[PDB]
RNA sequence: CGGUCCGGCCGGGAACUCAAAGGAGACUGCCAGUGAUAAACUGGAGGAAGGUGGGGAUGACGUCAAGUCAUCAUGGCCCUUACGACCAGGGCUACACACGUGCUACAAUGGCGCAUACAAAGAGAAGCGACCUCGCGAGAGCAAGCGGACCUCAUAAAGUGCGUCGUAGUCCGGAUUGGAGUCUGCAACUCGACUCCAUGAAGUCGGAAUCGCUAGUAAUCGUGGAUCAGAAUGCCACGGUG
């Protein structure tokens, strides 16, 4: 079922299938389901079309899609050409939040090099 | 130990059945000191076995167990620059521990959903002479006949 | 331990008990939730820098009494781990003795 | 009206002497003494590096044992409370008076 | 009258009062099944009264504190045995023969210096 | 992050900035206070921030507001390993 | 026993758990056999415990010209407008890489949600901070009690019952990054801890090889303490299952 995230969730429980939307996690999806008066156990199937329709405008109250990717990128690109310390970290590909770089920074520097 | 002639720490029997053999089986199956979880797995799987194989709850466990007990094992001995697999007869108590340990280790490497369902199927086809547990016994016996020259 | 360091610690203690512990009001009762969100709060925050960089009780390293050793301090005796064992052993510390249990 | 007094010492032999001495001193004055009561003893514990340098794995464990006693006098006639102020209590014990 | 017994285990201490009557078991103002959710604890507690088969002829009033479920069940068995002694004193041998008289003196060994646990040492490497 | 109960700038620089605004734009205002935040009153000024051994010049613009002064003056130099 | 608001909470009791002082107890002491009419060995009784009952402290003459002249002391040498002293900022936290020790995982003996049991040992005055109100939360406001078997830290967690997920890079994993915050502290850019929303790397049990452990031990679950304004996955201790 297409939702405001125009991606398509599937035949799982409602509170979990909503998580397939970028920008909606676990608690936020619970809040969405609560405002529409839908139990968290019902699957995405066996939902009346009006129920889906009232779901998808509740999601509209959050900035959650490739638009959210837009501001995420802009916030990083801002730091980038601004030139602050985190700009240098982001441009060099090194950890940004003051972690340890002498060893053990693999998830940020990528796989091992010789 | 070089000199100690060790005794034997006692083991309490089963609560439900009063069996001194299932107490060992629960000990073999338990992990990280969680005795209750192991008892839940063994009990649920045992009763599933009983109703699948007719009746006779714990002697349905015995009939599969008697199908996997080894009678001769192999010991590796280094001669002078070569080593031989001298086959030696198995002690009585060791026969059960070997038979239980193989069943449990085989009842872990399956694709079933639960541990109770996983273990019950192993306990069933072992009584029917199928399963990795009985194959282990066949392999050990086959290995121990090829070296019967060294007995 | 380099008497210069011992001199620094005694100076810091004397400078702390003169200014603060009485001029700690301006960091508590003006950095407080009330209607003083005007210059009343702002000027106190600005004034707190003008005080000497020392006198802040978070700047005394709590050295050993007999040696000025900066590491391995024990508050109950005020000595370092070296001198406590040495003095414990001759019998200078009442009550203290080797523990086995 | 009742006075309650505590005794703290670093060793049990010295606290026993002071306790048995104070307790009988009041009993002479005609009052009835309630106790003594052995309270649980607080044992502090310390571990220290014994080398000046490295060798972390070789340490030493010490302890301070604080023995404690309690006695209650529940009819302090006006000759007992003062009299207690002039007892030859030891040096290694200290007393606490409460009314 | 009532007969008394103190039994104890890892860290628990149980005191047990036996009275003639019918089988009634109360632990800390609760029934036996309401207290011990672990079914082997129930079997442990009952063991002495099934050996000496005075199981339906006695009231048991029991107060337990300290330790965990298996320690408390262990203490109760020891406390029951001692009190059941104070009842008959002639059925001692067979209670001895089952290992119930012995007060299990096992305790958790203290952590030692340089070891991550009582005996587990850290890893050792040559190079 | 510090509290919403006040941002933090030092006095010895707050005096200098407010004394230099009216007198125009001049040679960069030299400072050691890396730890003082940037105010909207600073926009368009040039400040020479310390980095341990020099005073690197930063020209304050609108987007660098709320940031500490220090994070436009790296203290470590690193050009590769081979 | 009586009272009761069902709470040892009241009168009360000194029995019981417990606290902490003083004793008793275990000695191959007794029995049988073996042994050189020995020393000691096996087994049995009794007993809470049996053969050093369990654990600890306790480290002989000496070895490595082992370590420490940066705890301290000290022979010789060296500096004395500096190799001494004061101050701000930085650095010890860098990052192509390699090793050691740990922690968290790869899931169903499990994850998540609700209900619900059972500890021990500790610390506290420039301290521990209750009840109550506010906040989704970290916390904030007011403020009792406690130098403590009395008050606070402080609701143990594995467990247990119900439900759900159904073998999927997943309702596993929680690294990284963006945003928004609290708290300590003159001040969290370099370089703090924690909270909430969002994101969801590698990882599907690990080559040659190698480490610890003989019983309340290994494995596993939590708790406390010292250092300390704040800042442990480390160290030192404690109990649960086993
Ligand atoms: K998502
Ligand atoms: K010298
Ligand atoms: K620095
Ligand atoms: K770093
Ligand atoms: K490693
Ligand atoms: K670690
Ligand atoms: K910082
Ligand atoms: K996931
Ligand atoms: K701290
Ligand atoms: Mg760090
Ligand atoms: Mg400090
Ligand atoms: Mg443990
Ligand atoms: Mg080493
Ligand atoms: Mg008495
Ligand atoms: Mg040398
Ligand atoms: Mg040197
Ligand atoms: Mg370092
Ligand atoms: Mg608390
Ligand atoms: Mg898988
Ligand atoms: Mg864990
Ligand atoms: Mg801890």
User: What is the whole-number distance in angstroms between the Cα of residue A22 and the centre of ligand 1?
Assistant: 4
Overall number of domains in chain D: 1
**CB of E82 closer than 8 Å to CB of E6:** yes
Tell me if residue E54 falls in helix, strand or coil.
coil
User: Which distant-in-sequence residues (6+ apart) come within 8 Å of F36 by Cβ?
Assistant: F8, F9, F10, F13, F14, F68, F69
Contacts 24+ apart (CB under 8 A), C78-86: C81/D48, C81/D49, C82/D52, C84/D46, C84/D48, C85/D48, C85/D50, C85/D60
* Helix or strand (DSSP H, E) at E82: helix E69-88
Residue E65 neighbours by CB distance under 10 Å: 12
* Helix or strand (DSSP H, E) at C82: helix C81-90
F71–A78: do the CB atoms touch at under 8 Å?
no
d(C-alpha A46, C-alpha F64), whole Å: 52
Nucleotide nearest residue C64, measured CA to C1': G71
* Helix or strand (DSSP H, E) at E64: strand E58-65
- Which residues is B87 bridged to in the sheet? B74
Q: Which residues of D touch C (CB under 8 A)?
A: 10-11, 43-46, 48-50, 52, 60-66, 92
Write down the residue that tokens 């340990």 correspond to.
B101
Tokens for F42, please give them: 């600073």
Q: How many CA atoms lie within 13 A of E94 on its CB side?
A: 11
* Helix or strand (DSSP H, E) at C98: strand C97-98
**CB of D68 closer than 8 Å to CB of D12:** no
Phi, psi torsion values for C98, nearest 5 degrees: -65, 130
Distance E118 CA to G24 C1' (A): 33
**CB of E30 closer than 8 Å to CB of E61:** no
d(C-alpha C76, C-alpha B124), whole Å: 68
Quick check: bond before D76 cis, omega within 30?
A: no
**CB of E7 closer than 8 Å to CB of E77:** yes
Tokens for C96, please give them: 């203290």
The three state secondary structure string of C39-76 is HHHHHHHHHHHHCCCCCCHHHCCCCCCCCCCCCCEECC
**CB of F12 closer than 8 Å to CB of F69:** no
Q: How many CA atoms lie within 13 A of E119 on its CB side?
A: 2
d(C-alpha C97, C-alpha D5), whole Å: 28
User: Which distant-in-sequence residues (6+ apart) come within 8 Å of E102 by Cβ?
Assistant: none
Taking only Cα atoms into account, the Rg of chain F, rounded to an integer number of angstroms, comes to 14
User: What is each CA distance from C38 to B44, C41, F15, in whole angstroms?
Assistant: 72, 6, 19
Residue D16 neighbours by CB distance under 10 Å: 17
How far is C-alpha F56 from the chain's CA centre? 10
The three state secondary structure string of chain B is CCCCCCCCCCCCCCCCCCCHHHHHHHHHHCCCCCHHHHHHHHHHHHHHHHHHCCCCHHHHHHHHHCCCCCCEEEEEEECCCCEEEEEEECCHHHHHHHHHHHHHHHCCCCCCCCHHHHHHHHHHHHHCCCCHHHHHHHHHHHHHHHCHHHC
The three state secondary structure string of chain A is CCCCCCCCCCCCEHHHHHHHCCCCCCHHHHHHHHHCCCCCCCECCCCCHHHHHHHHHHHHHCCCCHHHHHHHHHHHHHHHHHCCHHHHHHHHCCCCCCCCCCCCCHHHHCCCCC
Closest CA to A38 of A59, A61, A14, A16: A14
**CB of E16 closer than 8 Å to CB of E74:** no
Distance E110 CA to G217 C1' (A): 12
> Which nucleotides in chain G have some atom under 7 angstroms from a protein Cβ?
16-22, 46-49, 53-58, 67-68, 71-72, 84-102, 108-110, 117-120, 122-123, 126, 140-141, 148-149, 156-161, 164-167, 171, 175-179, 181-193, 196-202, 210-220, 226-229, 235-242
Bridge pairing between strands B83-89 and C73-74 = unpaired
Q: What dihedral angle (degrees, nearest 10) is formed by the CA atoms of C96, C101, D6, D12?
A: -70
Q: Residue F6's closest chain C neighbor by CA?
A: C42
Q: Residue B12's closest chain E neighbor by CA?
A: E44
* Helix or strand (DSSP H, E) at E62: strand E58-65
d(C-alpha A47, C-alpha A2), whole Å: 13
- Which residues is F29 bridged to in the sheet? F47
Contacts of F64 in chain A (CB under 8 A): 82, 84
CATH 1.10.8.50 fits A2-65, yes or no: yes
User: What is each CA distance from B135 to A27, B47, B103, in whole angstroms?
Assistant: 51, 25, 11
Dihedral over Cα of B18, B21, B27, B30: its sign: negative
d(C-alpha A32, C-alpha A62), whole Å: 10
C99–D52: do the CB atoms touch at under 8 Å?
no
Q: How many CA atoms lie within 13 A of B18 on its CB side?
A: 1
Distance C27 CA to G103 C1' (A): 40
Bridge pairing between strands E24-27 and E58-65 = parallel
Resolution at which this structure was determined, Å: 2.6
User: Which distant-in-sequence residues (6+ apart) come within 8 Å of B71 by Cβ?
Assistant: B89, B90, B95, B141
Residue C19 neighbours by CB distance under 10 Å: 14
d(C-alpha A31, C-alpha A38), whole Å: 10
Task: Kindly tell me the burial class for residue B51, based on how many C-beta atoms sit within 10 Å of its own C-beta (0-12, 13-18, 19 or more).
Answer: exposed
Experimental method: cryo-EM
d(C-alpha B67, C-alpha B85), whole Å: 24
Decide: C and D in contact? Rule: 3+ Cβ pairs under 8 Å: yes
**CB of D71 closer than 8 Å to CB of D23:** yes
**CB of E93 closer than 8 Å to CB of E85:** no
**CB of E15 closer than 8 Å to CB of E5:** yes
- Which residues is D65 bridged to in the sheet? D43
CATH number reported for the structural domain that contains residue D31 in this entry: 3.30.70.600
DSSP character for F68? B
Closest CA to C45 of F69, F11, F2, F41: F11
- Quote the domain boundaries for residue E80: 1-127
User: What is each CA distance from D3 to D71, D73, D97, in whole angstroms?
Assistant: 9, 5, 7
Write down the residue that tokens 């939702």 correspond to.
A3
Write down the residue that tokens 């802040």 correspond to.
C56
Q: Residue C30's closest chain F neighbor by CA?
A: F5
User: What is the whole-number distance in angstroms between the Cα of residue D98 and the centre of ligand 12?
Assistant: 43
Helix axes B92-106 and B57-65, enclosed angle (nearest 10): 100
Tell me if residue E5 falls in helix, strand or coil.
strand
User: Which distant-in-sequence residues (6+ apart) come within 8 Å of E73 by Cβ?
Assistant: E9, E36, E38, E40, E41, E42, E44, E45
B15–E42: do the CB atoms touch at under 8 Å?
yes
Strands (E), E1-44: 3-8, 13-20, 24-27, 30-31
Taking only Cα atoms into account, the Rg of chain A, rounded to an integer number of angstroms, comes to 19
**CB of F72 closer than 8 Å to CB of F64:** yes
Distance A86 CA to G191 C1' (A): 14
The CATH class of the B20-147 domain is: mainly alpha
Nucleotide nearest residue C82, measured CA to C1': G71
**CB of E5 closer than 8 Å to CB of E85:** yes
- Which residues is E3 bridged to in the sheet? E18
**CB of E4 closer than 8 Å to CB of E64:** no
- Which residues is F47 bridged to in the sheet? F29, F58
**CB of B46 closer than 8 Å to CB of B59:** no
User: What is each CA distance from E40 to B15, D61, E33, in whole angstroms?
Assistant: 6, 41, 11
Task: Kindly tell me the burial class for residue D4, based on how many C-beta atoms sit within 10 Å of its own C-beta (0-12, 13-18, 19 or more).
Answer: middle
Tell me if residue E119 falls in helix, strand or coil.
coil
Helix axes B92-106 and B115-127, enclosed angle (nearest 10): 130
- Quote the domain boundaries for residue D84: 2-99
d(C-alpha C78, C-alpha C9), whole Å: 14
**CB of B111 closer than 8 Å to CB of B121:** no
Bridge pairing between strands D59-73 and C97-98 = antiparallel
User: Which distant-in-sequence residues (6+ apart) come within 8 Å of D65 by Cβ?
Assistant: C95, D10, D11, D41, D42, D43
Write down the residue that tokens 């052995």 correspond to.
D38
User: What is the whole-number distance in angstroms between the Cα of residue F1 and the centre of ligand 7?
Assistant: 10
Residue B123 neighbours by CB distance under 10 Å: 24
**CB of D92 closer than 8 Å to CB of D26:** no
DSSP character for E108? P
Closest CA to F74 of A94, A70, B111: A94
User: What is the whole-number distance in angstroms between the Cα of residue A91 and the centre of ligand 9?
Assistant: 37
Overall number of domains in chain E: 1
Q: Residue D61's closest chain E neighbor by CA?
A: E113
Helix then strand count (H, E) for chain E reads 4, 5
Q: Which of F11, F32, F33, F36 to mutate to test the interface with C (most CBs of C within 10 A)?
A: F11
Phi, psi torsion values for E118, nearest 5 degrees: -60, -40
User: Which distant-in-sequence residues (6+ apart) come within 8 Å of E36 by Cβ?
Assistant: E27, E42, E45, E69, E73
Residue F38 neighbours by CB distance under 10 Å: 23
Distance C77 CA to G88 C1' (A): 36
How far is C-alpha D51 from the chain's CA centre? 36
**CB of E76 closer than 8 Å to CB of E68:** no
Size (chain C), residues: 101
F72–A78: do the CB atoms touch at under 8 Å?
no
Closest CA to D35 of D67, D4, D79: D4
DSSP character for E99? T
**CB of A64 closer than 8 Å to CB of A79:** no
DSSP character for E3? E
Tokens for F32, please give them: 């050691």
Question: In angstroms, how far apart are the furthest CA atoms of chain C?
Answer: 62
The three state secondary structure string of chain D is CCEEEEEEECCHHHHHHHHHHHHHHHHHCCCCEEEEEEEEEEEEEEEEECCCCCCCCCEEEEEEEEEEEEEEECCCCCCHHHHHHHCCCCCCEEEEEEC
d(C-alpha F49, C-alpha F69), whole Å: 7
Contacts of C88 in chain D (CB under 8 A): 62
Tokens for C62, please give them: 């709590």
Tokens for B45, please give them: 């799987």
Q: What DSSP line would sit under F22-61, residue for residue? A: HT-S-SPEE---TTSB--GGGTT-EEEEE-SS-EEEEE--
């Amino acid at each position: 079922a297409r939702i405001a995230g125009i991606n398509i969730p599937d035949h799982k429980h409602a509170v979990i299938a909503l998580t397939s939307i970028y920008g909606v996690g676990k608690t936020r999806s619970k809040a969405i389901l609560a405002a529409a008066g839908i139990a968290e156990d019902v699957k995405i199937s066996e939902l009346s079309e009006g129920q889906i329709d009232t779901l998808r405008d509740e999601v509209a109250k959050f900035v959650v899609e490739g638009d959210l990717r837009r501001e995420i990128s802009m916030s990083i690109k801002r730091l980038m050409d601004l030139g602050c310390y985190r700009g240098l970290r982001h441009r060099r590909g090194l950890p940004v939040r003051g972690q340890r770089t002498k060893t053990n920074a693999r998830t940020r520097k990528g796989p091992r090099k010789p | 130990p070089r000199r100690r002639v060790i005794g034997q720490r006692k083991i309490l029997p089963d609560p439900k059945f009063g069996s001194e053999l299932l107490a060992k089986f629960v000990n073999i199956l338990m992990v990280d000191g969680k005795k209750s979880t192991a008892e839940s797995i063994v009990y649920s799987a045992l009763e599933t076995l009983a109703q699948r194989s007719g009746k006779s709850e714990l002697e349905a466990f015995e009939v599969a167990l008697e199908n996997v007990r080894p009678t001769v094992e192999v010991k590796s001995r280094r001669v002078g620059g070569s080593t031989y697999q001298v086959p030696v007869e198995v002690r009585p108590v060791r026969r059960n521990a070997l038979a239980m340990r193989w069943i449990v280790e085989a009842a872990r490497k399956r694709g079933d959903k639960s541990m109770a369902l996983r273990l019950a199927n192993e306990l069933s086809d072992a009584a029917e002479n199928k399963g990795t547990a009985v194959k282990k016994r066949e392999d050990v016996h086959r290995m121990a006949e090829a070296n019967k020259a060294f007995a | 331990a380099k008497q210069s360091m011992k001199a620094r610690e005694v100076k810091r203690v004397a400078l702390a008990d003169k200014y603060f512990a009485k001029r700690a009001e301006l960091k508590a009762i003006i950095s407080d939730v009330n209607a003083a969100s005007d210059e009343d709060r702002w000027n106190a925050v600005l004034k707190l820098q003008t005080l000497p960089r020392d006198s802040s009780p978070s700047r005394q390293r709590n050295r050993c009494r007999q040696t000025g050793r900066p590491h391995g301090f024990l508050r109950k005796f005020g000595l370092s781990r070296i001198k406590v064992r040495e003095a414990a052993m001759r019998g200078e510390i009442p009550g203290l003795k080797k523990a086995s249990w | 009206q009742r006075i309650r007094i505590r005794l703290k010492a670093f060793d049990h032999r010295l606290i026993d002497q002071a306790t048995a001495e104070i307790v009988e001193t009041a009993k002479r004055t005609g009052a009835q003494v309630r106790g003594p009561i052995p309270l649980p003893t607080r044992k502090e514990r310390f571990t220290v590096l014994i080398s000046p340098h490295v060798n972390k794995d070789a340490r030493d464990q010490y302890e301070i044992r604080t023995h404690l006693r309690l006695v209650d006098i529940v009819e302090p006639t006006e000759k007992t409370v003062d009299a207690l102020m002039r007892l030859d209590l030891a040096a290694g014990v200290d007393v606490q008076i409460s009314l | 009258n009532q007969y008394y017994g103190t039994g104890r285990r890892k860290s628990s201490a149980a005191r047990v009062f036996i009275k003639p009557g019918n089988g009634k078991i109360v632990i800390n103002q609760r029934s036996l099944e309401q207290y011990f959710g672990r079914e082997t604890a129930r079997m442990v507690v009952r063991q002495p009264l099934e050996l000496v088969d005075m199981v339906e002829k006695l009231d048991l009033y029991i107060t337990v504190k300290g330790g965990g479920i298996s320690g408390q069940a262990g203490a109760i068995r020891h406390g029951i045995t001692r009190a059941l002694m104070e009842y008959d004193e002639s059925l001692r041998s067979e209670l001895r023969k089952a290992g119930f008289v012995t007060r299990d003196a096992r305790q958790v060994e203290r952590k030692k210096v340089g070891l991550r646990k009582a005996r587990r040492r850290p890893q050792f490497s040559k190079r | 992050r510090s509290l919403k109960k006040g941002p933090f700038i030092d006095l010895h620089l707050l005096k200098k900035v407010e004394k230099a605004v009216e007198s125009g734009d001049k040679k960069p205002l030299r400072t050691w206070s890396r730890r003082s935040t940037i105010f909207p009153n600073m926009i368009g000024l040039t400040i020479a921030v310390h980095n341990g051994r020099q005073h690197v010049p930063v020209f304050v613009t609108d987007e660098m507001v709320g940031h500490k002064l220090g994070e436009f003056a790296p203290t470590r130099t690193y050009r590769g390993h081979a």
